[PDB]
C-alpha cells in the first residue's frame, strides 16, 4: 500500500499500519 497512518489509520481496507505506514501481506504494498 505504501500508505501512512497517523497512529494507525489506513485508507485502503486490508492495509495494516506499522511504523506509521500501511503494509499488506507482510510488505509495503
UniProtKB/Swiss-Prot annotation:
Family that this chain belongs to: Belongs to the cyclotide family. Moebius subfamily.
Chain's role: Probably participates in a plant defense mechanism. Has antibiotic activity. Has a diuretic effect. Has a uterotonic effect in humans. Active against the Gram-positive S.aureus with a minimum inhibition concentration of approximately 0.2 microM. Relatively ineffective against Gram-negative bacteria such as E.coli and P.aeruginosa. Inhibitory effect on the growth and development of larvae from H.punctigera. The unmodified form has hemolytic activity, the oxidized form lacks hemolytic activity. If the protein is linearized, hemolytic activity is lost.
Boundaries of the shown chain within the full protein: 93 to 121 of 124
Disulfide bond annotation, renumbered to this chain: 1-15, 5-17, 10-22
The record's account of how the chain is modified after translation: Kalata-B1 is a cyclic peptide which occurs in three forms: with unmodified Trp-19, with Trp-19 oxidized to form oxindolylalanine and with Trp-19 oxidized to form N-formylkynurenine. Oxidation is enhanced by exposure to sunlight.
Species of provenance: Oldenlandia affinis
Expression tissues: Leaves and stems. Lower in roots.
Domain comment quoted from the record: The presence of a 'disulfide through disulfide knot' structurally defines this protein as a knottin.
Name of the featured protein: Kalata-B1
Amino acid at each position: 500500500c505504501g500508505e501512512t497512518c497517523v497512529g494507525g489509520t489506513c485508507n485502503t481496507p486490508g492495509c495494516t499500519c506499522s511504523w506509521d505506514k500501511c503494509t499488506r501481506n507482510g510488505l509495503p504494498v
